[PDB]
Design a protein around this ligand. Structure first.
Ligand SMILES: [Cl-]
Ligand SMILES: [Cl-]
Lengths: 138, 138
């Protein structure tokens, strides 16, 4: 929703990392200048860039694990529930299927009814911990 | 086991980060010297340290999520299976309990028998992805 504040917070971060990265690349090159005025430096620059480049590669984020998404909704599950076949779906989606499509396990075809659905408490914790450590979500 | 190779691989990393970190702190201070020879630099040093300090704070690792551990084994689950009450245990541990302790859900006390155990396929994927992205495990 109005959670566009995550972009603002990371805006201030990205901004500082860029300033630090430029500053550091300046000191380096300048040193290379002084040295080649009287290289190993070129290597320090690569690793130095890679360091900031990596802490930016993971910033690409948007990588919502597929194993945290429903088989029906194809997206992060809010209420993960498992069937007796061991397949986890998002409650709203599965209860939708069992009421609109039919009384069968979307994947195993095994006979199924809403009352057999079991709350996957463990998965709910995994997803919650995921949504916390990853504000870009939602 | 002999997977002590993870310590060797990260040994080479940690070693390079330290060398880069020292080198960078040298260029900085030297610059501060030249400036204070004719500070904002002190701030660049803090953030620069924090940068390497952070990529080391997470290296503390050993943080095996509790929600990935069994209620009985109290440790990373190899074969996560859920009960009809929605509680996930490691197979070996739960089947041990149902055969040595009694036919009841360790936490909900609800009546239980090995044949009711359901394989928590979703959790198995979560843990597998965890063991991969974290070699220090095992
Ligand atoms: Cl789903
Ligand atoms: Cl357990």
């Amino acid at each position: 929703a109005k959670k566009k504040r995550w972009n603002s917070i990371e805006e201030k971060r990205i901004s500082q990392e860029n300033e630090l990265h430029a500053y550091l690349s300046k000191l380096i090159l300048a040193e290379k200048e002084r040295e080649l005025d009287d290289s190993k430096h070129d290597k320090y620059l690569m690793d130095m860039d890679e360091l900031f480049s990596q802490v930016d590669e993971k910033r690409k984020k948007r990588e919502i694990p597929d194993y945290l998404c429903g088989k029906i909704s194809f997206e992060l599950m809010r209420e993960p529930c498992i069937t007796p076949s061991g397949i986890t779906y998002d409650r709203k989606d599965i209860e939708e299927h069992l009421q609109r499509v039919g009384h069968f396990d979307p994947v195993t075809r095994s006979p199924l009814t809403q009352d057999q659905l079991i709350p996957n408490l463990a998965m709910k914790e995994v997803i919650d911990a995921f949504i916390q450590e990853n504000g870009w979500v939602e």
